[PDB]
């Protein structure tokens, strides 16, 4: 009676059925029928030099935790744009038209990593 419940996988069908397990495509099919890899699609791991740096996978037990404050858009506004805006309004140099000097970005399409359509994996 075949099998209803067990999931549908490349192991199950005929020769003609190949369904990946969910790894991401690195390329396309070329002229010779041979497969071509696109160096840009292959994720390049960015790994910092860890050797000269002191932090460890675990933390000392007598070391204290702290009162837990989730970072909010407000707190981030106040630690960054608030001192600068206050400095330039107190000096009357404040310009409601261009906020770009404070770090505000009008549109995301220029820069490499955009936040809203979210150009980057991790």
């Amino acid at each position: 009676g075949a099998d209803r419940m067990s999931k549908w996988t490349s192991k199950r069908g005929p020769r003609t059925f190949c369904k990946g397990r969910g790894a991401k495509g690195t390329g396309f099919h070329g002229r010779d029928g041979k497969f071509v890899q696109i160096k840009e699609m292959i994720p390049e791991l960015v790994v910092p030099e860890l050797a000269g740096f002191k932090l460890k996978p675990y933390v000392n037990y007598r070391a204290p935790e702290g009162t837990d404050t989730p970072l909010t858009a407000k707190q981030l506004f106040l630690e960054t744009a608030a001192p600068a805006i206050e400095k330039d309004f107190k000096a009357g140099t404040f310009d409601p038209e261009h906020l770009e000097k404070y770090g505000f970005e009008p549109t995301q399409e220029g820069k490499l990593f955009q936040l809203y359509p979210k150009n980057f994996p991790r």
């Binding site: 744009a81 608030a82 309004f89 505000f104």
Partner: protein, 159 residues
């Protein structure tokens, strides 16, 4: 859609029957929209157009329920818009004809906010209203900047 008795004797067979209107291909001229549409109409439609004395009259002069067509309501929405706007593009060359025509229909003229909602399905309406309300959510940088300017201008005015 219904049933009939054959022979009209109640004692005969009872039988499903459907009575279909006789349809015609006729091209009609709209003055206000200045156009000839090729429309399927009935003899009844032609008689009502005759009775209301104009094609455009018939379309303006009849309620939504009596036309029954979505196309009728769109014709009406169109020329109602052309009347409330007094659209110059009607007859670009001759303001004489334009004023002459816009004249006879002056009884049906309705404001603009009303005129674009007349012939609308609930679907089309909901869509339209969704498009008028379409806004990209305002960056929190803006809002926080305005709160901060409020606070700074009340710190400056207090001393």
């Amino acid at each position: 859609l219904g049933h009939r008795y054959v022979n009209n004797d109640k004692l005969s067979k009872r039988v499903r029957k459907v009575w279909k209107p006789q349809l015609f291909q006729r091209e009609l001229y709209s003055e206000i929209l200045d156009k000839r549409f090729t429309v399927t109409v009935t003899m009844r439609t032609l008689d009502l157009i005759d009775q209301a004395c104009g094609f455009d009259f018939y379309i303006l002069k009849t309620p939504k329920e009596d036309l029954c067509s979505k196309f009728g309501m769109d014709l009406k929405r169109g020329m109602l818009l052309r009347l409330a706007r007094q659209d110059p593009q009607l007859h670009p060359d001759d303001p004489a004809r334009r004023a002459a025509i816009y004249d006879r229909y002056k009884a049906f003229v309705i404001p603009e906010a009303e005129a674009e909602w007349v012939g609308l399905t609930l679907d089309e309406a909901v869509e339209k209203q969704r498009l008028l309300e379409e806004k990209d959510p305002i960056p929190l940088f803006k809002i926080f900047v305005e709160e901060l300017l409020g606070q700074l201008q009340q710190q400056a005015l207090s001393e």
